[PDB]
Design a protein around this ligand. Structure first.
Ligand code: HEM
Ligand code: HEM
Ligand SMILES: Fc1cccc(CCNCCNc2ccnc(-n3ccnc3)n2)c1
Ligand SMILES: Fc1cccc(CCNCCNc2ccnc(-n3ccnc3)n2)c1
Ligand SMILES: C[C@H](O)[C@H](O)[C@H]1CNc2nc(N)[nH]c(=O)c2N1
Ligand SMILES: C[C@H](O)[C@H](O)[C@H]1CNc2nc(N)[nH]c(=O)c2N1
Ligand SMILES: OC[C@@H](O)[C@@H](O)[C@H](O)[C@H](O)CO
Ligand SMILES: OC[C@@H](O)[C@@H](O)[C@H](O)[C@H](O)CO
Ligand SMILES: [Zn+2]
Lengths: 405, 404
């Protein structure tokens, strides 16, 4: 056969070869001697220019003007810019293309069937924390759209050599506070204890609920981060109820509509956008299974199973499984009731399979992180479980970056 | 560099140093990870070094390393490879090698049990008939009236001058799959090809959904021979649900003994092409994969309809709900039948314990996260939150191509 990874779908028996991986200009953490594909985290003008040239080539390919005069002119314009400044700047349409391509290229995102439909907000003119806040508020308003969620990304100015970064300190635009208690337990989201304490140290009067929306800690270059409280009316939340378990509503659970990652680095052509929050809509298991049922998160599995009167004293009763299913159903039912976009893990994974087929034809493959694409409940009940996947890093890319503090 | 391995639920970090012991390459490269792939895409000195390495492991295990009998045994192996191009394991070494292959098996969640393995030396087997007798004893021993006991039976090693001893079945016990005229399959669609091979080799087919296949056993360079397992040897569990009284009427059942019969056991450079092993089931293998996979018995919709769920839409999570009840039925029924089974919560918890032991014992543990994390309720189990390093240690079980 061909010398490219052979990729099998075990449910269907179909075979594809990934040739796209040939485009990867960046090494992952795996070697022939060991696979580290389950690790969450991994671990100069000449370099910039090659990355720039490569991106400009991608861009001109995408507009079908590869090799053209404008392509060569743009390439030269970029070299000369890097020549005199040590950096360069993207044209608006390049930024739009690059942002979309970074999403398209994101191995961990199951939502990529939507990749061509991304509203890119250019906020590269932003010059203060206050303006960052306005742009973020605007983003949230646009993306939330009163429950009819729209994918969006707001791109703040790129890392500039000699100058400090724009950084959103929160990992998400909307996340709930986590308050460490005397007993050592946490009220709210344990994931967010550190950022919550930073909000308080920076002047935020903290609530004491399990679902207090965190304020934004926004950092303009070479300034201390500034604190901005999101106006409650901008943050759409959904009270959780269950379609058949009437008591479920009395748990007082809720989640926010808008999943917006705010601390990833968007890298395009060697340029680094350290603040480029993007948002899509939730896949229900992100909330139902991970946020609400993770032992290190809200960890509500036992609470719900007890209310369901399950035998929580034995693993074989599958109480964790029964309760998790009902929480997930409650999440779906409540978002649907509240008319807030949400996709269940079956619809999401079916759409990702369609995406894989599209991308096979468009690009000869699709980088995908199986561990992340397969949902955290009902894994093999979704088609992606049976789909071998090849993981590799393509640029443009979203990258994790260390917390600014 | 040693991979830093974090558990995201507990925040604890380990470093895998064991992976440095890997002498065999997996499918990954820095350019791309192929960790989700089920199968791999594809002389005296090398054998001698694998042999020496293994003998060294063996003598280190009985803490007689560098000793006398150690050096004699290394000498024996060297003299035998030098003159014959191969060598033979002492039974004690074979026993050690098999347990170690199990211990090293990245996809096995049952490895807490690795030290308790009954090893049957069937290397004195000269015919398919004798293989069948060994296999029958294996099954009897392993099944043990439902009190399942891990076992492996090791048939003669591969030899350069001849065909392999092979069991053609992928499992000792598996159900037939009969391709119907209308393209559908009665029974297990996973077994259509082996079912057809059995028929072509003269088996009279049943037409049930759960007809236990006969064994196609191949002695070297001979046509495979067909042997029917004595039904009394094949313990089966009718599946009923503890609360859904209609579930038993589905007529579903599964066999007690999960026994892989087509993997190659490699020990010290020697390859055992037939070395069927068995443990006991983790419920999700049956409830979720065997019964609910779309390309297997695919019973999700039937159960969901019997549960009277809204089957028309994904958002009702009928699949998830049905799957849970099926797994619950499997556990209840095996527990009712007094047949050893482990649920995926118990199994993954014990596996975490095993990871801890192995971290202390050997500085790591090869683990294939995609396989260790159960097919349902992944993140509800501790292994989901556990980063794992996957690599090939020897002794090893490896896949091998189907003999036909
Ligand atoms: C449109 C609806 C979308 C859906 C349903 C969706 C779905 C998902 C899901 C379920 C994850 C796993 C997150 C986790 O478990 O932590 C994820 C991750 C990710 N998504 Fe999306 N996504 C969507 C939109 C977007 C957009 C608009 C972008 C960027 C422009 C994007 C880029 C990413 C990236 C970079 C990750 C990795 C995040 C991480 O590793 O923490 N996604 N997506
Ligand atoms: C004692 C109880 C045992 C349990 C609960 C157990 C559990 C499992 C499970 C859940 C898998 C994944 C199976 C699949 O989905 O295909 C597996 C695979 C495997 N197990 Fe075990 N196992 C046990 C005993 C053994 C023994 C005795 C051996 C060998 C001596 C063994 C070696 C292996 C190997 C090599 C695999 C990979 C098989 C494959 O890729 O198809 N296991 N085990
Ligand atoms: F940098 C890191 C260090 C440790 C864990 C980690 C995982 C981050 N995942 C958080 C949840 N992912 C989210 C959250 C909200 N929204 C999305 N989202 C939005 C659109 N597509 C996905 N994804 C990163
Ligand atoms: F060579 C291959 C080609 C395609 C799939 C594949 C994996 C199939 N795995 C079969 C199910 N695994 C089983 C079955 C029975 N028994 C166990 N088992 C018993 C003890 N430990 C595991 N595991 C190999
Ligand atoms: C250890 C493991 O890599 C880790 O728990 C991963 C597994 N898969 C995941 N998949 C998604 N979508 N999101 C996650 O946070 C994780 N966590
Ligand atoms: C494509 C994917 O690797 C394949 O479906 C794997 C996923 N995880 C698995 N895990 C186990 N335990 N058994 C399996 O057969 C599989 N199949
Ligand atoms: O409270 C601090 C954590 O939420 C923070 O460190 C996040 O885990 C991080 O920003 C995710 O990238
Ligand atoms: O019907 C033949 C299949 O059961 C067989 O090819 C298995 O999939 C394979 O042998 C598993 O190793
Ligand atoms: Zn890998």
């Amino acid at each position: 056969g061909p010398k490219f990874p052979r990729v099998k779908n075990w449910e269907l028996g179909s075979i594809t070869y990934d040739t796209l991986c040939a485009q990867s200009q960046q090494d992952g953490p795996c070697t022939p001697r060991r696979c580290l594909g389950s690790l969450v985290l991994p671990r100069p003008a000449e370099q910039l220019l090659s990355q720039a040239r490569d991106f400009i080539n991608q861009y001109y390919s995408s507009i079908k003007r590869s090799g053209s005069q404008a392509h060569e002119e743009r390439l030269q314009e970029v070299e000369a810019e890097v020549a005199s400044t040590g950096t360069y700047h993207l044209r608006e349409s390049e930024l739009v293309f690059g942002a979309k391509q970074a999403w398209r290229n994101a191995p961990r995102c199951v939502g990529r069937i939507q990749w061509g439909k991304l509203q890119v907000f250019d906020a590269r003119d932003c010059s203060s924390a206050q303006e960052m806040f306005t742009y973020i508020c605007n983003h949230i308003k646009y993306a939330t759209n009163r429950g009819n969620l729209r994918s969006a990304i707001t791109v703040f100015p790129q890392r500039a050599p000699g100058r400090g970064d724009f950084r959103i300190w929160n990992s998400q635009l909307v996340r709930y506070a986590g308050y460490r208690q005397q007993d050592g337990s946490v009220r709210g989201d344990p994931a967010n204890v550190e950022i919550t304490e930073l909000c308080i140290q920076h002047g935020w009067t903290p609530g004491n609920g399990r679902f207090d929306v965190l304020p934004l800690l926004l950092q303009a270059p070479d300034e201390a981060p500034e604190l901005f409280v999101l106006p409650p009316e901008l943050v759409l939340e959904v009270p959780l109820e269950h379609p058949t378990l009437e008591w479920f509503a009395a748990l007082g659970l809720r989640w926010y509509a808008l999943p917006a990652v705010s601390n990833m680095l968007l890298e395009i052509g060697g340029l680094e956008f350290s603040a480029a929050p993007f948002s899509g809509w939730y896949m229900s298991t992100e909330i139902g299974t991970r946020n609400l049922c993770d032992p290190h998160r809200y960890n509500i599995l036992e609470d719900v199973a007890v209310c369901m009167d399950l035998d929580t004293r034995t693993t074989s009763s599958l109480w964790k499984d029964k309760a998790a299913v009902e929480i997930n159903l409650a999440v779906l039912h409540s978002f649907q009731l509240a008319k807030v976009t949400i996709v269940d893990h079956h619809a999401a994974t079916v759409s990702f399979m369609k995406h894989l087929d599209n991308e096979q034809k468009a690009r000869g493959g699709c980088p995908a992180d199986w561990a992340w694409i397969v949902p955290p409940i009902s894994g093999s009940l979704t088609p992606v479980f049976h789909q071998e996947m090849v993981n590799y890093i393509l640029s443009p890319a979203f990258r994790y970056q260390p917390d600014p503090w």
